Point group: D2
Chain length 502, copies 4
Amino acid sequence: SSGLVPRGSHMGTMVQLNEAGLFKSQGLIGDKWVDAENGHTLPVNNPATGEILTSVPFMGKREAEKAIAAASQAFTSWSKRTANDRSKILRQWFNLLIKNKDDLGKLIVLEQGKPLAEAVGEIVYGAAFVEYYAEEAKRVYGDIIPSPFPEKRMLVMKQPVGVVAAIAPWNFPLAMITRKVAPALAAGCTVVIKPSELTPLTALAAAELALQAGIPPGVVNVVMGDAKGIGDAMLDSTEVRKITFTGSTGVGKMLLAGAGKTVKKVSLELGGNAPCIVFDDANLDVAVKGVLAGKYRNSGQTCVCINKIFVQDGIYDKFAEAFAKAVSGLRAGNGLEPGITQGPLINETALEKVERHVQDAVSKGAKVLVGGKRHSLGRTFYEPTILGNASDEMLIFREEVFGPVAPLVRFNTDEEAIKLANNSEFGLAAYAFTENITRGWRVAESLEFGMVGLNEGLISTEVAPFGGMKQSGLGREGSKYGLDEYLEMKYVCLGNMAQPVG
Amino acid sequence: SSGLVPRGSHMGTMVQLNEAGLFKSQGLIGDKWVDAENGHTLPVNNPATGEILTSVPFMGKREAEKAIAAASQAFTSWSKRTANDRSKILRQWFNLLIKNKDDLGKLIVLEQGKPLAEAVGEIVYGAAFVEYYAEEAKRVYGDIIPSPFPEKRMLVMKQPVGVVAAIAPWNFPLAMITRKVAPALAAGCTVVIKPSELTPLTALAAAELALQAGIPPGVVNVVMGDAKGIGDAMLDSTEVRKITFTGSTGVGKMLLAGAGKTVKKVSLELGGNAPCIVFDDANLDVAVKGVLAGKYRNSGQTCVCINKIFVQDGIYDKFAEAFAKAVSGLRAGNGLEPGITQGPLINETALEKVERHVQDAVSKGAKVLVGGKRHSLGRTFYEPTILGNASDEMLIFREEVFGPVAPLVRFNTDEEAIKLANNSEFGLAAYAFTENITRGWRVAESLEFGMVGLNEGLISTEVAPFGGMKQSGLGREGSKYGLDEYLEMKYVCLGNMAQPVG
Amino acid sequence: HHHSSGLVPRGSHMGTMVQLNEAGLFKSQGLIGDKWVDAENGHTLPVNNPATGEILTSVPFMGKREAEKAIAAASQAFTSWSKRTANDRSKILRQWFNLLIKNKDDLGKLIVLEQGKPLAEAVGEIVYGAAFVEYYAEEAKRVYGDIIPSPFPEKRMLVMKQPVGVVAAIAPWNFPLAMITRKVAPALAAGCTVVIKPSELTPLTALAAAELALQAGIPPGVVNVVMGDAKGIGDAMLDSTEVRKITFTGSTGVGKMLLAGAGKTVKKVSLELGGNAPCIVFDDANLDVAVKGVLAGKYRNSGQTCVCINKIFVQDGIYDKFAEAFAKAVSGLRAGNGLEPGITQGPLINETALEKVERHVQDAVSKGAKVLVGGKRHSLGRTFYEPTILGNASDEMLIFREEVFGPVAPLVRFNTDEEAIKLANNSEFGLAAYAFTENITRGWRVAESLEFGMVGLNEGLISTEVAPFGGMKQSGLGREGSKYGLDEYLEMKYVCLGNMAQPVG
Amino acid sequence: HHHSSGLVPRGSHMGTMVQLNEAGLFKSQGLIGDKWVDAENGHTLPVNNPATGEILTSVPFMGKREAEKAIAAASQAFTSWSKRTANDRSKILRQWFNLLIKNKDDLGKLIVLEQGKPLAEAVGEIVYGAAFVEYYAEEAKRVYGDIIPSPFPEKRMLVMKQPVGVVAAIAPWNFPLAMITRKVAPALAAGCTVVIKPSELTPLTALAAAELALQAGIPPGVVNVVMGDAKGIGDAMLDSTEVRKITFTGSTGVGKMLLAGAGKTVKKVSLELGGNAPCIVFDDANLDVAVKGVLAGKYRNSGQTCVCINKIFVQDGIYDKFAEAFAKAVSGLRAGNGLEPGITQGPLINETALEKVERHVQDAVSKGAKVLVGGKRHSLGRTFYEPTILGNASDEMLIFREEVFGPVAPLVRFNTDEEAIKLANNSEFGLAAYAFTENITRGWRVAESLEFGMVGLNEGLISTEVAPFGGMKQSGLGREGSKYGLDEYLEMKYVCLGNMAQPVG
């Protein structure tokens, strides 16, 4: 035969991305797109097909040092622009992300696997942080504080902290980049970001659009490869004043310890193990829809995912039946195909963890209501699963599954469920469903979690502060408060001041 | 002879303190004043006389664990009181500190050595944090954020973080206790505090007055002795959610690293190396008075102390002459004696550091204008000193002296002085003197320091945020912002909400 | 000196009056600057106890001349008071707060004597009224200015907030202490001085409060108290250049005239006027909570509160059970003299108030309302009225359309949520409203939908110093209580610094 | 169709008018709901170019009936507009902002044609006026409510902020675009609808702005524009129940009447009235900064700004050097038609304005003032007046006491700082003031001391959308620009939730 023999299954999509200038195979340091110093690379694979999409550089310490130096050089000028000037440029970036949302969504699907509707939704959500902080840049207010000394006047100024090092995970290849880069740039900081080596392409496309928006070279730098070597260069640098990380708890704890030697500002978001309480007086349809959305978005691979569901005795049977019917409607497959609502797990390690959790639960008495095996598609597709008769001795109760498995734990009293929900070292998201005003407010107040969905399974938004309590993190992303993570307060005391006349 | 043979030189003062119930020889754990588990003790000595004032317990890990358990038990009830209820109790504590200020001032003099006027001033200043946060407790405002989803409503709540571990240094035996304890208690947290083993008595007296105010047992706990063992118990505890430390940079960096393993919230204030810029157009009298106060308060032993003075070429001679005349008016001695304005350095290690700094400067060309030797009183008294012709190669330029030594560095241009002032890893206080509005605002904006005194050498106040940039710290103490260090934000998303009618 | 001498009129509660007089809290003069004064012509007005008819004392009948002198004293005192630190004003205001609380039992008795409410409610009013003094003593130190990012590189932008100047305050009779402190405390905290005209019906409590202000160290002229010819005093307040802000609580008709009159000198005006509070009891209300809440929200102060429930809309499914349980609750109330323990309803303030209540009840019964409990003057006579419930009320009744200010609760049946909310919003009033529902969606919806400045949701007692109180529509302008209450007494100033330099390095 | 036909009056700047008409920005009708309309009786008023005397077009002469119809359209549109999300309103307002900026050059020319200012100032006004639209598009999403710590364990306390309702806005002629957007942008952002009456002297720019609002997707009835009988329109705005807030910028006499009239329905009112801005040049001013700043602060818009410098107090030591350098600066100004490049002074708006300027100059010269530059009508005639400086001015002169609104700068010598500050504060005006000093203590002191809503310190050009603008004393109520500007269009609501439970564990 004669004809095109593609190496991959989605060449038309990759060609369209490349024609749009959104398909990159190099990192970004200052005013250049670059390879690693020795030309080494790593493959980026499509999780639904196994195919290599492209190689990207395998960078380390030296490239990270060069990126930090570029960011440090760019900081002086960027930080001294007016807020209005930074705001205009950031809005241009926001507009370009939205203009390119359909192609950027497809790029997320290719490298990370989620359904196209979720990927395009991630562009809209991620871009919203850029818009939000473009507006908030102009609202970094200082204070004039009444002085108890007649001869003194007291001010508070808020100024950018300096060069920021940012590390982002694979589960939201765009939004985890903008949630960190947007506030940093708005405040007047510059950044060195290390996206996940599993999903770097979307970060590179976002950086290309930042350059097109007029973000000066060196304000945004993107490096990837040897995550440990890059992270150590970020921690060892004097010029890096702040480090922001989202990812695994074990890695985050090491980063936080390492940041202590230079007293860096740190914000981080780590593992969660979100409880969801369905009370007897929940609106059943609202609860089923909210739990389905909160558990199975991104095939369970979200930091705010519902991990365990406590269901009150009176509603248990009706909830379990309606929830199983809802879960049975999910469809796994390649995210570029219409009607697909579950993508593959990111890799074999993730699949093996899901299988370990399910095997442990079934060995301790859990009942498989739906699913409980690898999907017929193979690879890293796992059937959406519900485990009935779950308990506090199970691995899935104690640890974050990060997959499409919903364990149900029966409970009797409200106090019992709230105390169980609060009995862990996690503190990211939690959820509750009840129609009663007193009960709803009480549960929301009582839960020891940074976010609470009350009659809501989809809580993500750029306007509100997201982050963890206890061992789930430090600091917040989104809202006015997210910008404070990138600022230093300064108290200025003016002396030898005079009394007003007449 | 017949008659009283006191062991110390200030028995009348110690008897008056004891009669007032302010002289303690035990720690405080829950509802009991306690010894160490094995009865071991450490002496607390008067630095002006060498005499033992009293012994206090030499506690460690086990007592710290018991104090944390008491704080954890007390937290449930204290955190659930209304803000108004906590506020009333904290105001009672504030009133008792002020009522007892003269005796509490004398206790600081005995254990730490500063002049009585400075010690009574420290009570007024330290007590002011108690008042401030009693008022601010009622002003922990949450938010209602406009929701971009018509069917959702969005709230932000702010709630106490939990048990706090606090470590305080010796240079402000009262104010470093209240700066940490007051916001923690106001927010609804409970505390375990380890005062300096050099100056624990004032902390114990403050805790006695807290009990008299109606602060419930276990809300405030005070332990001391094996600082490493106590600190390790604080870091290892799950229940300790936040740790606040003021002290040496080396110890602080180890604490911050150690806190990473449980993802604790940390705020800390470390070494500073404050530059002071005297421009050619400074008001000479204002500059001399401000530099004298900012350098020599507490014999130079303040975290915000002026460490190095940059003096512009045109004013150099007139400043050096007037400043030497001002420094020559200082008088060293026992802080309980009238007219004394310089107390002894805390210990022999501090004296040896001062001597090392002076010897290094003189070996590199500095000119002793005033002082430059141990005072005739001996012990740890050091003559107030001025070193002319100082330079950036000197130990005193590069490191925190924490003593009564003022080095003068000549400079030519404004830009030169600002760049030199900003060329370190310190970032706590800085000072500038200029009569010009443009120059003054410019220098205040340019300085990379958490606090700036502009035509002011005495900047301390509870109403404004104090803390460090770069390697000088994390977080702030004082002002509305100080309370945020003890709170966790919670976003609550209400779903299935209806549109307003008509 | 012999017990038969008549210089002090003999009467009931003489022991209480003697104890108040001994405490320095029983006054028969106004306060202008550093003097307690009579009116220039020695005219007076009597203050009578509404439960007994007995004279308590007389107060001056002052007018224009005395109001001008009080304004001049306040203007003279403003210069120094406004330039004190916030901390200095805060300390003095806390001393006043502490004195009010120290004297609460005697001050409560004084409110009972002149206004009539039960002693427990009067002592509660002292605690509530004094709370504004404490709140604004703290808030004085929290008048924050701003530093705003400048879009011009060479400029820096600040916002300062400074006291407006002399304030004229006019207070009504239903809370003789709290209506004084709600206005005086924020004004003083900001650094303003005040001329206050308390109600001529209940002036004694204001004078006692002013004596305690002087004892607290509030300098003479910072607080001045005048009363008598309300129109003449009000016209002097409006005509004065130096009065920069007026604050008024009282009748809508008088408030509208004051607002119009303030226009000629462009004064800042805050006011709180008539309300006509609807209360919606939905079918899914917790019955006990609704009954208890409506009982409290309607009958406190015998219905004489600005935020009192005026009309209750009850959903068809809960109507019968609510009406029965509510009648049983109301039957427990007991009218009498507020100094007698066990009494829970005092007399209406005067005969005009009683006649308005009788007019509302007669109109309702003539249009088909059913008297479920009460509906007549109490056997005690004077201005005591039986606690009343009118079933089968409608939108054509005077009590539906106008503020009754008395112990009468009309019940209006409704079918749908939307019907009740549209009905509740169909007036020019906009002060308080109330709703009872256990459902989260319905509760938030009703609270958002109601066109009122305050909403009680599963709550009949909403008053607090920490939250902003005031009216929408024709019920008022501005707010009292909360951080926002202090802004009524401040002027914003934008300061633009030019020729500024770029930061170095 | 033949060039000799007279349907379109021939004249100067026809190319510009044709380009504006082609762009959809040249209107001869008002806007009520979904229609562009004439007055009910077809009456009109002409709009003439002040530099040429030529007719631009006519606009309707509307009155009470049309204002009532506009209010009804705004009331109908309010229900839906107020219930959109803030994000939805923000997107639409940003589309309007972008359209104003896209059309800035043509809109600038339209301002020149009807109002007369130089084209550079008119295009600058579009950028400044449009900035309010952008600012409040962003601020719409930042209308934050509060959760307040409750002193009652069983209650929770919230503060919500919701749009006030239909707004009536009245704007003057000196900034034909920015005075429209400063009022319309925050109103729309909050969720209010508007009826605006632009100045009958400069209505075209408002109509162009409203066409662009419709193109942006602002629904019909959200913005309505009426003009003609200003008294009849204003009375319809005041008489309407549905108008909940009035905002007015213009003359003090008219503003005081509107404020008085608003009292009968207890409307929220914000207004900005006459100013009489003092400018203090201290002996230690940077001479160049003061000269440049006073030049800009006095002569922008030929002195026809609300914040224009009205009187300059110059300290004895710097007087001679300032007067000499300032005269040299002023000599550079050039009067003419604003469409001619190089022109920096346009004509005064009308003959009444010119006569007031002549009255002020004649009064000053009769009382001893020295004409340093100008002091007569410009050789161009019409309403052009020579830029003038009057030396040796005093407090007995009309120009010291009253707002000149023209290109005349009077200089008053003073000796001490305290003298100048007391003099600057001795009026009933309170809008802008200015000061020039290099000293930090003196600068902060003067800024704190001045009894004015805005202070320029070493700055003669202070206008910005990011900071609060408005007057103290008789210069106004409320603020425009900054986060605070949005509060003028909101009502606070306190919601108290009762029967709440204690948190668990």
